[PDB]
Amino acid sequence: RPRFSFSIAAREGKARTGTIEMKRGVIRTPAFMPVGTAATVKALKPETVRATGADIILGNTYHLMLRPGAERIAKLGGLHSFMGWDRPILTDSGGFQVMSLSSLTKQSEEGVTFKSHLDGSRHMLSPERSIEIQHLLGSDIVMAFDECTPYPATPSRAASSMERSMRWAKRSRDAFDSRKEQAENAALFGIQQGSVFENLRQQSADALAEIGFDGYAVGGLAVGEGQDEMFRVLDFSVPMLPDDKPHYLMGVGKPDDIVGAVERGIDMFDCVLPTRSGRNGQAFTWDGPINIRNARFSEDLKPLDSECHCAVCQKWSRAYIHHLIRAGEILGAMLMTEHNIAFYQQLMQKIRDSISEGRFSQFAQDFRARYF
Amino acid sequence: RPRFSFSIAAREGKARTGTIEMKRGVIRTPAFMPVGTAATVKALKPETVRATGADIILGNTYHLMLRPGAERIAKLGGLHSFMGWDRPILTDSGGFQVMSLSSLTKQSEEGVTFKSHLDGSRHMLSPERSIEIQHLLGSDIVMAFDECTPYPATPSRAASSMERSMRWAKRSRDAFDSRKEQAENAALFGIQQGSVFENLRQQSADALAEIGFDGYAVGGLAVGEGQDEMFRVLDFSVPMLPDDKPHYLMGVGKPDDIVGAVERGIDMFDCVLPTRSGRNGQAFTWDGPINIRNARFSEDLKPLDSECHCAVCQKWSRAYIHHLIRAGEILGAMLMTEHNIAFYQQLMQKIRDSISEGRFSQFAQDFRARYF
Ligand SMILES: [Zn+2]
Ligand SMILES: [Zn+2]
């Protein structure tokens, strides 16, 4: 296969379905990427992640650089070999986590210095170091390093951060391009900023297109603005991005959000919701999520969801999983997580099919009616 | 297959290898039974437990009666259906845990009353109720309910407890026999008591044989006496049990203990060591156990054990598992546990083969030389 090749097979309104071909595999879009925080998709073997239908997973650069460490992973053969996942891996730049997880952060035009949340060790990140770390991990889809904008944001601050982010986008592009093996085997995505301001989103989009990337992410959303606002921002933001490249909405999960985002032109998603919510007791069903710990499931012999084709729903009852989660058993986390990730992949499949068949609008409608 | 049929295919000294045929499946002996505390072998799907080679697992009656509850499990279809394991299941009587885990225990000739360690609920157990609970769980191999003897024990106390245990053995036998469906589909094992006293062990053995059971367990060991003492007790105790029935050494795990026990006539074992030690960071290898958390494994690309044929050793490195355990990742527990249980099953296979081939003595010798 080629280094990177995105092809759109069908459209319906702003929605698109197609594939991204990369050396390690084909990615079907719209796609949902399970999150592998510290070189592991929590509670699941890689083969299980693949069994649910995932074509690619996401790796957190921030966590990985802290432990086991970027250089260590490279010495060990790369993230793929390390964790046992041989298909595409997209790595975030690590910038978002630095701001939300680390402490004593010192930001500058050069980059950011911070202290680990694990211990007191000092660490540094910049466009060049972030790109370098993603190379060490052996990432297939590299995300440009940027500076996030907290919500709510003032026009002035949003502009400054977006402007710095665009300057950092160019540095990321050059860093990536100067590393032969990376430029030849991986892909680089740029990230659009601008908060909820249309003019800034337009400026960011133009700057990004000017530089040129393999894909464009819509950053700065899913941070407290609410679905209504997020959708409004997507309404005018996605159209600003190059139509022939993938559109990636970072940090957006939750079924309804995904459906609405696809309706607005988004091709890729990632979210910890499936995994995290699974461990906490929340299981997704076509009739909406259920809290398996609730006493009403204590003797419910039915599977988590009546339609789900995952291995968990084929073999175990809500009653058993209810017991497992209440008892704090690891298998509880394993089964809930497998089902939720499978549910998400089934959602993406239904979205891809309905778009290809020109009935996505109806699907979105039917989906919401039952889900809510 | 029959309700129960034990056949010895080969012998070497006091060691024996053969099979136990039951309605739900064949059990190869000597056998090791993974422990499924609360309707789950910690961190493993049932199919994974089976993949390691296990022919049967053990269920803890004490824990199960506390939660999800015996009656509830029966209403749900039984333990097998509940947890997804369709092969034989041996359930302990719950007596040992009552003494070591519960509080405010009130013992009498009728039975024992106690309070849960989970909450303050009151519970009761006796020969009749224990047998009844094992029936509700749908156990294949039922253990008679007895009264354990703490170590060290005085001749007088050991005699009293053993005597009460034998009286309770008869009650267990009658309870089991009066329940048609249980007597026709399950098996009942008696438990030998007597502490470290030969005369008492002989009296217990005679009383047990007098009543008649499908198998005989050696109870009261592995509670602090040390291997030397345990072996000494086994030396004269096992020969007292009927030769044509299975001999089950309760709570004995740890590789060397198992090998020595088999050398002394033991056919069945169970122990939490494999699972628990796995979660804590201890992995078994033919060169002895290793603590995967140790810094020396941080960049060790080799598998947990150089010979192990388990899925974990075929796919992941010590370095990766080292990272997982230090990071507290669930997959760390999953992989360590799968490997340890597989290691134990491989140990039992090597024991069965060497006995059948008349070279068990040499195996035991070679095993210890390298293991230590
Ligand atoms: Zn499911
Ligand atoms: Zn192994």
Curated annotation (Swiss-Prot), chains A, B:
Pathway, per record: tRNA modification; tRNA-queuosine biosynthesis
Catalytic activity: 7-aminomethyl-7-carbaguanine + guanosine(34) in tRNA = 7-aminomethyl-7-carbaguanosine(34) in tRNA + guanine
Sorted UniProt keywords: Glycosyltransferase, Metal-binding, Queuosine biosynthesis, Transferase, tRNA processing, Zinc
Stretches assigned to coiled coil: none
Enzyme Commission number(s) from the entry: 2.4.2.29
Primary role: Catalyzes the base-exchange of a guanine (G) residue with the queuine precursor 7-aminomethyl-7-deazaguanine (PreQ1) at position 34 (anticodon wobble position) in tRNAs with GU(N) anticodons (tRNA-Asp, -Asn, -His and -Tyr). Catalysis occurs through a double-displacement mechanism. The nucleophile active site attacks the C1' of nucleotide 34 to detach the guanine base from the RNA, forming a covalent enzyme-RNA intermediate. The proton acceptor active site deprotonates the incoming PreQ1, allowing a nucleophilic attack on the C1' of the ribose to form the product.
Designated name of the protein: Queuine tRNA-ribosyltransferase
Cofactor: Zn(2+)
UniProt enzyme class: transferase
Residues the record lists as binding Zn(2+): C308, C310, C313, H339
